[PDB]
Structure formats: C-alpha cells, structure tokens
C-alpha cells in the first residue's frame, strides 16, 4: 500500500534534498552512484547505496533506465524520485517505472509527453488560452523560417524543440546570420537529441524570465506557490534567481500566476511543475513548462513556507493537497519574504566560465540567521571531476525586504571559502553589487550588456 522505501535516480545536492524529505516523512532511502561518483556525498547520505552503470561513462551510468529499475526492484524501493535533470523528464524512464509497478514521483505520462516538446507545449497553452510568443506554427524548415522572418520581421529567435539549457538556441537579425543560426541549431539538435525539430519565433528584447511554481494533486487541486524571477542570465543560462519578482507589480505577478494555474488546470497537471514566462512591459508570454522539481525550488520554499519535495512525495502517495498534506487555500498561500538563490559552481569567470577541476583543500561555510545551505559535493578533500556538473553548493538568503537579502548574500559570498578550485564567487559578488539587480529590474540581457561585471578584484589569498 503505502511506500516505505524510496530510490533517488539522481546525484549531488538534489539527491540529499530528497533524502532529507524522505527522512522527514519517515521513508527509508536508497541511493545510486556511478563508479566515478564513488566519493559523492549523496552516496553515504542514504540508508542503502548501490553502484549503477558498471563499465559505462558516469553520465550514461546515471542515465541507464534498466539498471536503475533493477536496483529499485532488488532493493525493494516502492518509489523513484528522479530529481532534476538526467531522467527527470524522460518519458521512457517514467513509463518503464510505472510499468514495473513502482511509483514515479512526477507528473502523469501525458504531461511529460506534452511538455517534452515545445510545439506540443505551445499548442497546449493555446488551448488553455495562455498567449505564447508570436512565432511560426510548429517546426519549420529553413525556408519556412525565412518566410516567417519576412512576414514578421527581425529579430527572430531560433530554438530547437528539444533544445534545453541554451543548446540549440541562437538569436538572428540578418539573413546570413539566420542561415548560420539554423545550421548550428540543426547540428546541436541532431547531435544531442537526434531530432531536428526547429521552430523560429519573434525575439523579445529585454524581457524578464518569470517562472511560476505549480503543485498539482491527483484529486484535481492545483495551486501556485507564487513566482520566481530568473532574469539574471549569462548567455541564456540562469545565474541568480530571486523570488518573488520584486521589480514586477504584485497585480501583474498575480495575473502571471493565475495564467500558469489556468494552463495547468486545463492540462490537468499533477505533482510539481514550473511554468515559464517572458515578461515585457505588461505583456507576458508562455515559453515552456518544466514538469519536474526545479533547481531553484528552494527560494519558493522560503517565501511560501511549503516544502516542495515533501509535497511531491505526498502527492505521489496520492494525498489530498489541502486535506491531507495540509496546504492552505490559494488566497492563503503566504508571501513570507524575498529570497535570492546563487549556485556557487566551479566554472572560472576569469577563464571564460569553463568548469574547473581539482581538489578542494579547504571549505568554509557560513550560517546564521536568514541563510539556507544546499551543498552538493564540495567538502574539503573532494576531487572535482570533469564528468559531472560544476555545481558545488546552492546558497539562499531570505529576508522580509529584498535589500537585506542582498546584504546577507553579500555577507555569505564574502564569507564563503573554497580554495584549490576556482569559483564564480567574484562574479556573483559583482552581479549582486550592481544597482540593476538591487533595484530588481534586471533583464535577461543585463549580464551581456554590462562589461563592468567582469572586473574581478585582485585577492591576496595568503596561504
């Protein structure tokens, strides 16, 4: 009946977060790890740990559906939480997990099918009366894209359907440049995902990347947990996420959250999900839905007081969202404060943001009032391999006023000490020192149009 053992098909800090949620819910936990991930923190943070993908690349080891399912069945896990990334959105993974009889902690399979493709997601937003970005219908060839550029005009944004995390995504304003962008996007789409579905759309200039956290229930209860602002981006990759969007007016934020709720209610969404929007001068446009727990769910947890991962596990258990989990009504969902998220990573801001590798000789972590710490593998003596993502530790500061949250993030970033590997901490310090970020009016072009952000000061570093 009720699940007792839970397996996490992920690594790093998200595995530890789900382990903490399962321990708080009284569920015994099971970890999986690759051979090159043998010294990861998440392996020893679980009750049972099993090696997966023996004789494979570590990324493919974590991506192996059959080995994870075999480990979950041999260990006796009744549920599989996929975390974020890797196989979190994989339709085949969730289908095979539900075929094996296990519980997949995530949305229903039709939601994964709809929101895996950007054309299908845009169509679903159209049936939900959520206005998307004006673009071409479906995925077109190069000449159909050129025709769209003819009728609607430059700029035109070229995005592959399966392109995620800025892989196949590239801007264009000239006809030759648009050919170059289509060529590169086709190469990236065939190489990474094997399907070259490219749709082109009008390029909004200076938008705000607003995203809304949604919790869905199997009974039909769907609530939002306010919105985050992920506008601070370097080359369309999120750097700093703030919540709520203090720059935006509260009524506008309510309209955006209500539109996300309307879309999720039309699709009948269940479990946790994030609806992403682009905001430009009182107009918001739907761009995608992330049907999983996101990396920056922590700041939503801080400003709403709602444990997102615990709610995910209880929804996968089938609990009622209000009666059994105990979440209040949507009008009673509180906005407790204003939180900032920064992921301290190994990529070198003085060396083109390439992920550095090495050994962590010393590691110092702040604490105190208003600080939340979510650490991956960043302990002293840990060897940072090039195999995995550069994420060392997510850190969040929360305060009633956004200015005090900025002050505490500055204190934390100056307090933080990782030596032996080179971090983006000077970059984060420079970004949060900026007045555009401090006023909350940062856009997605804020980083790329600010060369003063890259003037990292000399540090004495004696020792």
Ligand X SMILES: CC(=O)SCCNC(=O)CCNC(=O)[C@H](O)C(C)(C)COP(=O)(O)OP(=O)(O)OC[C@H]1O[C@@H](n2cnc3c(N)ncnc32)[C@H](O)[C@@H]1OP(=O)(O)O
Ligand Y SMILES: Nc1ncnc2c1ncn2[C@@H]1O[C@H](COP(=O)(O)OP(=O)(O)OP(=O)(O)O)[C@@H](O)[C@H]1O
**CB nearer to ligand X: pick between 88 and 346:** 346
Binding mask 275-314 for ligand Y (x = CB under 6 A): -x-x--------xx-x------------------------
The Cα–Cα gap between 261 and 454 comes to 39
Q: What is the DSSP letter of 454?
A: G
Q: Are 274 and 289 in contact (CB under 8 A)?
A: yes
Please count the helices (runs of H) and the strands (runs of E) in the chain: 15, 22
Q: Tell me if 240 contacts ligand Y by CB under 6 A.
A: no
Picking from 360, 457, 352, 446, the residue whose alpha carbon sits closest to that of residue 414 is 457
Backbone angles phi, psi at 22, to 5 degrees: -65, -40
Site for ligand X in 97-156 (CB under 6 A): none
Name which position in 53, 207, 244, 337 contacts ligand Y (CB under 6 A): 207
Within 10 angstroms of residue 113's Cβ, the number of other Cβ atoms is 15
Q: Tell me if 367 contacts ligand X by CB under 6 A.
A: no
Q: Tell me if 411 contacts ligand X by CB under 6 A.
A: yes
Task: Give the alpha-carbon dihedral of 354, 357, 360, 365, to 10 degrees.
Answer: 30
Binding window for ligand X (CB under 6 A); candidates: 40-48, 185-193, 203-211, 407-415: 407-415
**CB nearer to ligand Y: pick between 168 and 337:** 168
Picking from 75, 24, 374, 165, the residue whose alpha carbon sits closest to that of residue 9 is 75
Q: Are 276 and 287 in contact (CB under 8 A)?
A: yes
Q: What is the phi-psi region of residue 320: left when phi exceeds 0, alpha when psi lies from -120 to 50, beta otherwise?
A: beta
Q: Tell me if 2 contacts ligand X by CB under 6 A.
A: no
Instruction: State the minimum distance, in angstroms, from the CB of residue 343 to ligand X.
Output: 19
Binding window for ligand X (CB under 6 A); candidates: 122-130, 306-314, 411-419, 447-455: 411-419
Residues designated catalytic: 238
Q: Tell me if 462 contacts ligand X by CB under 6 A.
A: yes
Binding mask 106-135 for ligand Y (x = CB under 6 A): ---------------------------x--
Residues that bind ligand Y (CB under 6 A): 133, 157, 159, 163-166, 169, 201, 203-204, 207, 209, 233, 236, 276, 278, 287-288, 290, 444
Binding site for ligand X (CB under 6 A): 362, 411, 414-415, 417, 419, 459-463
């Amino acid at each position: 009946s009720h699940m007792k053992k839970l397996l996490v098909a992920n690594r790093g800090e998200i595995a530890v977060r789900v382990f903490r949620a399962c321990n708080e819910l009284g569920l015994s936990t099971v970890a999986v790890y690759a051979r090159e991930d043998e010294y990861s923190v998440h392996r020893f943070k679980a009750d049972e740990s099993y090696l997966i993908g023996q004789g494979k690349k570590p990324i493919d080891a974590y991506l192996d559906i059959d080995d994870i399912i075999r480990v979950a069945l041999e260990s006796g896990a009744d549920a599989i939480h996929p975390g974020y990334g890797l196989l979190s959105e994989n339709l085949e993974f969730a289908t095979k997990v539900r075929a094996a009889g296990l519980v997949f902690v995530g949305p229903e399979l039709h939601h994964l099918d709809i929101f895996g493709d950007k054309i299908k997601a845009k169509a679903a937003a159209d049936e939900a009366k959520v206005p998307g970005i004006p673009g071409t219908n479906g995925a077109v060839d190069i000449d159909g894209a050129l025709e769209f550029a003819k009728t609607y005009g430059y700029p035109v944004m070229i995005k592959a359907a399966l392109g995620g995390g800025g892989r196949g995504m590239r801007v264009a304003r000239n006809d030759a440049e648009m050919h170059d962008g289509y060529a590169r996007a086709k190469s990236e789409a065939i190489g990474a995902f094997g399907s070259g579905e490219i749709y082109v759309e009008k390029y909004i200039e200076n938008p705000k990347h607003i995203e809304v956290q949604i919790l869905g229930d199997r009974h039909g209860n769907i609530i939002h947990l306010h919105e985050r602002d992920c506008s601070v981006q370097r080359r369309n990759q999120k750097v700093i996420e703030i919540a709520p969007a203090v720059g935006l007016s509260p009524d506008f934020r309510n309209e955006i959250c209500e539109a996300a709720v309307k879309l999720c209610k039309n699709v009948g969404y269940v479990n946790a999900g994030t609806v992403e929007f682009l905001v430009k001068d009182d107009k918001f446009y739907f761009i995608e839905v992330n049907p999983r727990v996101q990396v920056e769910h922590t700041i939503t947890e801080l400003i709403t007081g709602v444990d997102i991962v615990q709610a995910q596990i209880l929804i996968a258990q089938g609990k009622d969202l209000h009666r059994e989990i105990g979440l209040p009504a949507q009008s009673e969902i509180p906005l407790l404060g204003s939180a900032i998220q920064c992921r301290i990573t190994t990529e070198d801001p003085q060396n083109g943001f390439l992920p550095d590798t090495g050994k962590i000789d010393t590691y110092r972590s702040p604490g105190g009032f208003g600080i939340r710490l979510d650490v991956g593998n960043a302990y002293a003596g840990y060897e940072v391999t090039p195999y995995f993502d550069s994420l060392l530790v997510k850190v969040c500061t929360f305060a009633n006023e956004f200015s005090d949250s900025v002050r505490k993030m500055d204190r934390v970033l100056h307090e933080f000490r990782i030596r032996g590997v080179k971090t983006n901490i000077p970059f984060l310090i420079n970004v949060i020192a900026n007045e555009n970020f401090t006023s909350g009016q940062a856009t997605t072009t804020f980083i790329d149009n600010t060369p003063s952000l890259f003037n990292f000061p000399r540090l004495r570093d004696r020792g």
